Amino acid sequence: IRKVLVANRGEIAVRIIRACQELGIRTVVAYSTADRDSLAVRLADEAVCIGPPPAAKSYLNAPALISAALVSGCDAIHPGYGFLSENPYFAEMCADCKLTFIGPPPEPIRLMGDKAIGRETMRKAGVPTVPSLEEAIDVARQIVRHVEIQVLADQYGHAIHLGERDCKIVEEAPSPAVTPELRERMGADAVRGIKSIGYVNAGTLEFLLDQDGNYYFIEMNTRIQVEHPVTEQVTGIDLVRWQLLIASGERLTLRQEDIKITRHAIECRINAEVEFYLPPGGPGVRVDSHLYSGYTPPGTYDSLLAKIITFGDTRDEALNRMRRALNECVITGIKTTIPFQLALIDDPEF
Amino acid sequence: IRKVLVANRGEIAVRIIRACQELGIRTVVAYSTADRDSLAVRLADEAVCIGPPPAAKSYLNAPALISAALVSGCDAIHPGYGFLSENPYFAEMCADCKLTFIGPPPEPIRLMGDKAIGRETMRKAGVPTVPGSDGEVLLLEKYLTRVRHVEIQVLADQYGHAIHLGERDCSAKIVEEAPSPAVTPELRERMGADAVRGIKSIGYVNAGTLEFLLDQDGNYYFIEMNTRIQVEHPVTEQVTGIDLVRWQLLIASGERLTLRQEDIKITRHAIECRINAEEVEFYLPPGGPGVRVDSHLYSGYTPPGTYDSLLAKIITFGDTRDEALNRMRRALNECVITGIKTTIPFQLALIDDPEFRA
């Protein structure tokens, strides 16, 4: 992979540019009339305006995105999260036009696009899923947290799991209800399922968790999630770089024994000019944002402004480091979701 | 500890305030008239002007600082690094006035304060010292050329327990790295053991850093010791998982180092760039994966010139040394410190210099 087209905006745009740069991958970014003043335009080597401020006109328009890759010499497109990431047509078009879609192959996206088909595809895999009048009584005499599992795979059949995250305004990894043994079990079933559908790259399978520890699959996201940085903190893995590498055609040199959860991490999403922006910092803080002082946020797309992810060796260490980092994050000129999140962290029930 | 007074200015002060806050400790900052505009003043719970812009007048005024603590309800004083961090008197003075110096005792400060006495004290403690003067002549040592500057972090408690938390290649101080490319895992255990015993011999409590020199054949020679926290400490905390400033405050509250040496491993590769000055109208720190930024900068901050040139500290980490150096390049091309010139361009050049990489 030599030059990538980033077809998203915001944080995820900056995050893909950061991954690319760390790997020697040049970058061209796709922006709308509304996202001209994005940090991504500055951070990226090159940039192309694909359309008008509305999304259908722009980010959800594949012909424009492919054209941008082509004018720019990009050999790959990173979908990001949202938009056309889980669109199987865009993937096919990227291939037809000889560009590498950094993601799952078109077919796994379609199977998991319909929740029902996916639940069945997974039942066939052996992944646990949710459990005449007379027949109905009989079925009834034999008959929840939200936890998500991270998976990653090669173009050669090796897949791994990178753990669980608990859920969206706050996400924490590890789950506070998950023992090491369940995680291992939840993950294997997941890796097996992704292998069943022939999955390539990163993805996340959502499950619902019982009082007794029984797990039932709900949906799979064939993309990267907003919730990825928390997994990384706990495991030491750059998932975004790995996607670029896998797309390059490289093998997953990682193994399951290699992946272990070492820290407790929590992520809070800060959502709605940012006249002043002082991120937090110091020990135990990661800020993934596209904000800067002097930024007039476009309201055409999201609420998201910043993502602070605090880690620690205990859950309370991390919760207390977020306390600090949310009282240090100075997003001025706009009202933010920081005040609410501060309440949640110190909610006794949380 | 209920409340601490931060007796320093700058990036450092925010570090101690940050640590204190994580541990539930109230913070009062002491500032010069020049340093009222600082972030530390905003971040801190309370603030006391201890005096005018000159240091002797303000930050080297132990009476002002002690009084400030007392008036503000502070029961501890973190001397920071620099200033009176290694002044034996301020430590004694703090005790007599019923305050807790967040640092070593007054005598390991005093012995190690004179380099000559330090070399000597450590020689008698079994640590190899540089071939040179036995005592004072000014001190003389031999000029060792083919040597590298490596340093060992030591942490210790009031009950006689001490651990080393690794090495730091302080060679290049504008750039610091951990692990050293010359120190093998065994040597880290050897060098650090010599450091742990030495500090046990001198009766040390709290954080300190013994500085050594390492020959081409791998042999170490003590040169100096800083009985304080260092500007170079974030790098180790990123390879070990231990907060050094938090532990300082804890040791002085009288708590036991619950860390055995088995529990400390250098599992990553970190590196740190000091961005120096050689109004910040626009400040934008780097971030993302693998970046930690310790700074006092803000968009609008008028950096004083008075005490240091330091503007920011960027620390990047990774499983490989080049992974570390490549996340740095990004971090440095992302840091926008506008309105003041900085050292960033020189840092980006060295990180990509052939020798450094090797």
Residue numbers in the entry:
A (entry chain A): 2 to 132, 140 to 151, 206 to 229, 237 to 341, 354 to 431
B (entry chain B): 2 to 138, 197 to 231, 237 to 342, 354 to 433
From the article:
Notably, C. aurantiacus BC1 but not BC2, as well as the BCs from S. coelicolor, Roseiflexus castenholzii, and M. tuberculosis possess a C-terminal biotin/lipoyl attachment domain. Crystal packing analyses revealed two BC1 homodimers, but only one BC2 homodimer in each asymmetric unit. The superposition of one BC1-BC monomer with that of BC2 gave a root mean square deviation (RMSD) value of 0.654 Å, indicating that BC1 and BC2 possessed the same BC architectures. Each BC1-BC and BC2 homodimer was stabilized by extensive hydrogen bonding interactions between conserved amino acid pairs in the N- and C-terminal sub-domains. Specifically, the dimer interface residues Tyr44, Val328, Ser393 in BC1-BC homodimer, and Arg310 in BC2 dimer are not conserved with other reported BCs. Using NaHCO3 and biotin as substrates, both BC1 and BC2 were enzymatically active in catalyzing the biotin carboxylation reactions. However, BC1 had a relatively higher substrate affinity and turnover number than BC2. For BC2 that lacks a fused BCCP domain, it showed relatively lower biotin carboxylase activity and a dimer formation in solution. By contrast, the expression level of BC2 gradually decreases during the transition from respiratory to phototrophic conditions, suggesting that BC2 likely functions in pathways other than the 3-HP cycle. Since BC2 lacks the fused BCCP domain, it is probable that the BC2 participated biotin carboxylase reaction requires the involvement of a separate BCCP subunit (NCBI protein ID: ABY36917.1).
